[PDB]
Design a protein around this ligand. Structure first.
Ligand SMILES: C[C@@](O)(C(=O)O)c1ccccc1
Ligand SMILES: C[C@@](O)(C(=O)O)c1ccccc1
Ligand SMILES: C[C@@](O)(C(=O)O)c1ccccc1
Ligand SMILES: C[C@@](O)(C(=O)O)c1ccccc1
Ligand SMILES: [Mg+2]
Ligand SMILES: [Mg+2]
Ligand SMILES: [Mg+2]
Ligand SMILES: [Mg+2]
Lengths: 357, 357, 357, 357
């Protein structure tokens, strides 16, 4: 009855409100692929993908353009659709870019399904909208900018911020954390992210020092694929190890959880497999007793977390703000799902034109 | 926006088309509780519960009548509803009758949600209807009746039947299986169910003898709660051990799968937690690499299996046929989801009146 | 020779001497089912069941009334009786309400058996009465009431109290514990109960802070069915994790102990399976090296603990005091078994009439 | 001293000498990306990539074109190069297409390094050329074509063939194997590949039946990422389970071997990480006691296997034969490394022009 009738993609490089500082340099734009899924019902589903680096941008888009053929004229049944794609890409490898691409389609399919039924996604999922606590996500900023950004966050009502650490010396790491703490007060949450930058022993050493500072969590201390190493680090800490942003599919999540690699999880709506993947991941998290946060995709994550039994935090990091309407709002540090069919993603066409690649 | 406005239950004892023969005697009726969930939208959700024994019938109904208060005036958000109930019953114990009761409400909530959206449940779930292979479910019938019933099944187009075994002597067990095989032919599926009747060593001995006969699976050889014993039995067999009908919630399923207690699973829509529980169970099954079949509740199971990544068999066992319209049909041994909003459960009011308890 | 001749049940809502404060509100009554088991010998056995919530009260009673038939005219052989019931309810699920019901019958059967032999239960069990140290059980009371109640306990001679914690903030938790400690002195026992209210990481964090305060034990930090989570929490602590109140049967206890989920146990005479279940549980506790305390049912628990090899504490919490004679006494913080045949439960009929439901 | 000066890629769809038959249909072409790595020394390194499906072809090429920038002006030090890329793609995910791309560069870098030193790759690797036993790789051909192809193989001197199985019915599987055996004789090797097509229980059942036929190995019985499932299947067999073609990097291989998922391995030079990845994989295989075969890339695999301590079989499957010189030869079923610097890959430019995409 409801069919998929077309797929259109547009590659853009959009300005970032909060320039991300790295050891490498300063990056003020994000490589995104915007997706429009047309249907026989007159509704158009929308999603976006994050490419991480501009090196992968055009390849991503082209990959989508080339997959369009397999999905056109198929029913708008996201679950059935995902299984078909999993089977089409089983030799090539259903992971990495291919998996990211499929996830973009899933997310758009689900947004369209919500439009057909005139209902917010969260409601289609069987749950009620609820406000979700969010933390403001910052970067490898230095003591001055880090504290600054943290003070503003608090001013805007957030009760937690995340900072990137992993300086050449541990003492720099500690300097950042201390200055934030001194400025925001003793309760406030301070999450730290190492971005896979340390080896196991270094991780244990730096982390035990942070643990004494009072951090909320320690995120991705070592190489993401090294589940066993994360487990070793975790085993020497009281503070929780957080991870999950790099899991491609619930099957990677399953592996990591099976060995007790972490005490917290934070899947990425895109890497986990879209709405379909998230729902699977949320069941795993519940069973393993793991509090589940989100990574990127703030708009859809708000919906997804409201339906998650072990929902923990929402990551505030606005990637697509320059080309979308501001329907998701933050009131007293909690994200508010807009009362709009689907995900509530509405393009700012005029702006898109500016960033086109 | 859409609220739950009332709950009405009716306890009945309905005639069974296929009298179930047991070691105890012959039982021709089923103790069921029929549920009607009213909503602010004008739609009425429907489900039924199976009480197993008439000893538990009135208690079940009364338990529902007493819970009505906690759900009335709550939004029709099955996922949110389940979490609320899990928290209300956490001291008393969210399992057994209480859990069965909550599952009845879940199933009705989901049927109503489908009505509000004018869509079949399977579609609301994100999948397409597909035909599901079914097996005809029989009892501890004796050689004559067992073969008879099996011949009729084949005549009606089924490609598999399940028989109950567990006679005083192994040789009786084998006599039943052989006569069926001789009558239906070498391909046909023959599933056997021990109904928790043996001890571990007996189980291993009888099962190895059956394995040589050519059975499809060996179901519940020993006490259901003994996961470790099932694992021991499984470890000495090539044929698959099947289990799951007695798991109360996905958390029991998780325990059993964690220790490799079986190679097949067959949750009961009621005991697993309704639609909400099934969806969770299906994610677990996928991750552990377990083919998932259903137990009872044929009407809703047809929908649920179409959305299950590792869907295996549908159990044909008509409990409520005397008081419901025949919307689910069997065409060439596969179950066909009716094209009707919700689950497609429609009462035969006039008949209900007859069976009322 | 001695037969069971009848079963009569009465549902009551009795006033509580110590109103239990919860996050929800104040509850001053308990939903109980009082049981009378008649025999051919002229003796009448007595027990009671706790329903937790009034939502389950009528269902419980009705369930008992409906089981009466299976037990009448059966010999007064509690062990044989339990096995029969386990087999009758094997499809429906021998757990939850059904199991609680069976346990009520067990307890009454054992009380009657003691009457037939004119001997206190403890003696029928092969042991001598001994005084058992008890702790006074309080609730989520706030700093003021908590300290108050604790001072009175000490005044009455108790050497330990249990308080419920799990406030929105850890610091509230600590405030309660500190004020009690300050008031009762440094030796006194302070047991804390989280009532399944935290997630694993929160549990580890709060518990390590309490451990520094000097608490006796940490009870049910997370969801009761999550044995593996309890093990994780336990693994990061020196203080003992206590659990067991929610185990339905010794088979659940066996599972939890098998994975080292706790260092202390505290089965509930009702949930564990009555006298028959307790005796089994006590053997397990001995073998696993676990000190065993009781949960509720103070009257019978006094007898049961005197026969328990690893007996630890008796929980003083008077549920049925308003409708029973005060035969169990407390002398210098130890419970004294009354010298009376059976359990020494004697109804205050006139009061019962008042609370009838 | 020796620098990388440029990267040129060409996407082609080349005819296959042996049309691969699938359940889907007949495919007579291969989507390949041909790579030319220019250097400051005047030498040009060559490699090719296999895209599996034409859906991924253009995306692959574009991805390479976009990475060219990061490698140009870098020294020709394949080991150092790989580490740089691993670090550049750590957020995006160093797996899937990105990893395949990097592997193409590695292979070309190593071919160029051999050219600079005027030596065959195998010799640069520290080993001597040796002839490697090869098996002729066929498809899901049917009884007639399968036997035919097998008879020709034997005629050309091969001592083993691989066939694809996984028919709707087991009996079809067995029919293929039997007819081959009957035609080639009792010694001859018959390898079978299920191509991830079965579930665990089906896998165990079909495999035990094959094991009785006398097959050389059972390849990829179930989903590639399910290491644990492969282990279960392996555990019920004497015949070896073979796997490895889908491992992306030695880190995936490490995971699978750690749990004993198989008794044989067969990494793909491209998916494993090129020359650099293969060398790492070969050390793992040696330590775990695993015989190591190759998957695709026959030209380079000949070199790689000669340097592999546990070398087992070379897979003969000519993907790029239409656009390259025939320097690798087969003499009496063994592959002979050509005596030519590098890998000995020489384009047939005139033919390339024909297949360009
Ligand atoms: C640093 C990060 O890992 C995070 O979680 O914030 C991140 C990863 C990828 C893109 C943006 C941010
Ligand atoms: C025998 C049974 O276990 C089955 O699976 O068929 C069954 C159990 C409970 C009610 C009816 C049938
Ligand atoms: C709080 C509690 O868990 C305890 O152990 O005291 C409790 C549980 C159930 C009823 C009363 C008290
Ligand atoms: C069937 C296969 O798995 C093999 O090993 O031969 C194969 C996989 C991918 C491309 C070609 C061949
Ligand atoms: Mg991160
Ligand atoms: Mg069964
Ligand atoms: Mg408690
Ligand atoms: Mg293969």
């Amino acid at each position: 009855e409801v069919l998929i009738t077309g797929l259109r993609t547009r590659a853009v490089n959009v300005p970032l409100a909060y320039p991300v500082h790295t050891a490498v340099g300063t990056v003020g734009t994000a490589p995104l692929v915007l997706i429009d899924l047309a249907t026989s019902a007159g509704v158009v589903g929308h999603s976006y993908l994050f490419a991480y680096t501009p090196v992968a941008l055009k390849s991503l888009k082209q990959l989508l353009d080339d997959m369009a053929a397999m999905i056109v004229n198929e029913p708008l049944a996201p679950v059935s659709l995902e299984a078909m794609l999993a089977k089409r890409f089983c030799l090539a490898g259903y992971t990495g870019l291919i998996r990211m691409a499929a996830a973009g389609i899933d997310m758009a399919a689900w947004d369209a399904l919500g439009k057909v039924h005139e209902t917010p996604l969260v409601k289609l999922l069987g749950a009620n909208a609820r406000p979700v606590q969010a933390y403001d996500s910052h970067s490898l900023d230095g003591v001055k900018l880090a504290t600054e950004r943290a003070v503003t966050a608090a001013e805007l009502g957030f009760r937690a911020v995340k900072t990137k650490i992993g300086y050449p010396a541990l003492d720099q790491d500690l300097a950042v954390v201390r200055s934030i703490r001194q400025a925001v007060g003793d309760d406030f949450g301070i999450m730290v992210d190492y971005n896979q930058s340390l080896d196991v022993p270094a991780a244990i050493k730096r982390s035990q020092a942070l643990q004494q500072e009072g951090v909320t969590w320690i995120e991705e201390p070592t190489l993401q694929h090294d589940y066993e190493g994360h487990q070793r680090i975790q085993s020497k800490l009281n503070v929780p190890v957080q991870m999950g942003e790099n899991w491609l599919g619930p099957e990677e999540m399953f592996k990591a959880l099976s060995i007790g690699a972490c005490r917290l999880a934070m899947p990425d709506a895109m890497k986990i497999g879209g709405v379909t993947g998230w729902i699977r991941a949320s069941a795993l998290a519940q069973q393993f007793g793991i509090p589940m946060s989100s990574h990127l995709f703030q708009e859809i994550s708000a919906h997804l977390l409201a339906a998650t039994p072990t929902a923990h935090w929402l990551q505030r990091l606005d990637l697509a703000g320059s080309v979308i309407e501001p329907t998701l709002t933050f009131e007293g540090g909690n994200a508010v799902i807009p009362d709009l069919p689907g995900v509530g993603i509405i393009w700012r066409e005029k702006e898109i034109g500016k960033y086109l690649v």
